[PDB]
Amino acid sequence: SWRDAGISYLRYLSIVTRCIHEVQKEGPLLTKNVRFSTIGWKSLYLDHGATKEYTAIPAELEKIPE
């Protein structure tokens, strides 16, 4: 199953939440809940002077951290 695949229980709940937000009806509630599933954030770490993306843990849920 998905357990030994390497993903966390929390990514699992978020996948379920994404699906629920899909199937539900169009309205103000959906307008609220699509926000609670959309991915827009990032991560950054500071080089000697510059910014660089810490891409060791992705935001998308299908992938696996390594």
Binding site: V16, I20, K25
Partner: protein, 160 residues
């Protein structure tokens, strides 16, 4: 140098949780049910007659003075019965349910939406999408099909 100008509060303190007493008296007649999604609640300590939950082990029923127990919620639906004989059903995405011996049920979930806000029409299309993902041999997509099916199958069976 100033000796520790700051003294930040412990943010847990602002809450007012239960005081689990082992009980030197009788049980109430109705459970005080509190249900919470991500941050905002939907129900704050409302009187309720009984509540039925879905779990990995299976489906359970909760009445006043139910035994103190805690376990995972499996992603599905939830049924709540108020004292007036009415009912209210809520789709959830996992979580943990804590039933106090005093009759105070605290439920924490990642999502909570009634059945009324879902249509079988839009649900139907996602099914074969999940099935195609499940049948498509790939560890990144197979699990997605399986999981979306896990939440859709109780909905497909509950609407019917």
């Amino acid at each position: 140098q100033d000796p520790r100008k700051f003294f930040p509060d412990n943010g847990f303190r602002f809450f007012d949780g239960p005081e689990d007493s082992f009980g030197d008296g009788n049980i109430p007649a109705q459970i005080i049910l509190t249900l919470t999604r991500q941050d905002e609640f939907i129900l704050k300590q409302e009187p309720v007659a009984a509540i039925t939950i879905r779990t990995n082990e299976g489906e359970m029923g909760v009445l006043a003075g139910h035994e103190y127990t805690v376990q995972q919620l499996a992603p599905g639906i939830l049924e709540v019965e108020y004292e007036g004989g009415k009912k209210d059903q809520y789709v959830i995405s996992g979580g943990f349910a804590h039933v106090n011996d005093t009759g105070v049920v605290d439920i924490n979930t990642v999502e909570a939406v009634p059945l009324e806000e879902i249509d079988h029409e839009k649900l139907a299309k996602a099914l074969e999408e999940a099935r195609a993902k499940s049948q498509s041999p790939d560890e990144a997509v197979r699990i997605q099909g399986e999981i979306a099916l896990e939440i859709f199958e109780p909905l497909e069976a509950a609407l019917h």
